[PDB]
Copies of this chain bind each other. A is one copy, B any other.
């Protein structure tokens, strides 16, 4: 029975409305819940969905070099596979294995509707509207490491921002935009931004182009025997059109705005 680490992040993994009357894997639904079922089916394994203990994606502590989040769970042998919106990055690919990507994304800007910001450049050029990112994820590192002038300017601002502009979860970033009467903008992956734009109260919007282009991968411990089969299953699901089918199911058929 494969221990799968994943994260409560809509619409990837969500507790079902009636989750309290249900047990095990059946408590959960979402894109990655269906994806998990499919990968397991093709690789012929049984599995247990577990929600990452610390609620994080995964970053390395600069001082201890200890990994947190789903990454750390694989690295420390606490999970067998991570099936989640987990961004394929160079620092991570050095410690864990990733499948070929199952979904594309880029960093994007979420505003409360009516906010006068069209681009990352607009953000960078003003101080009235605060902005930040998720903690312990790939978006923060993009800004941390960027040498592109606009993104470096944005970073120099964000990291010294008082009070803090960073949030612990996506939901927190989104609620922060919604309650902030236009004075907070949130930097987050286009997948998540586009999902939220189609849900009530319909008061947010993605503006501008994506800042980069990347993908999510299924992740396994280095040298895991599961990595081969899991990668081939991602390629098969894509070619059968199932990945396209699932994006449609979870994003646009679940639309409200």
Contact = CB atoms under 8 A, between A and B. Distances in A.
Interface of A: 88-90, 93-94, 98, 100-101, 104, 142, 145-148, 212-215, 217, 231-232, 235-236, 238-241, 243-244
B212 A241 contact: yes
23 contacts: A88-B100, A90-B232, A90-B235, A90-B236, A90-B239, A93-B100, A93-B231, A93-B232, A100-B100, A100-B101, A100-B215, A100-B217, A101-B101, A101-B215, A104-B213, A142-B239, A145-B239, A146-B241, A147-B240, A147-B241, A212-B244, A213-B244, A214-B238
Q: Which of A93, A142, A232, A239 has the most CB of B within 10 A?
A: A239
A98 to B, nearest CB: 7
A45 to B, nearest CB: 19
Contact of A238 (B100, B213, B235): B213
Grouping DSSP codes into helix (H, G, I), strand (E, B) and loop, the A interface class, with mixed when no group exceeds half, is mixed
Contacts of A235: 88-90, 93
Contacts of A232: 90, 93-94
Contact of A100 (B98, B146, B148): B98
Contacts of A142: 239
A220 to B, nearest CB: 15
Q: Which 7 A-B pairs have the closest CB atoms?
A: A90-B235, A90-B236, A90-B239, A93-B235, A104-B104, A148-B241, A88-B100
A57 B105 CA distance: 27
Given A90-B239, A146-B241, A147-B240, 10 more contacts: A90-B232, A93-B232, A93-B235, A100-B215, A100-B217, A104-B104, A213-B238, A213-B243, A213-B244, A215-B215
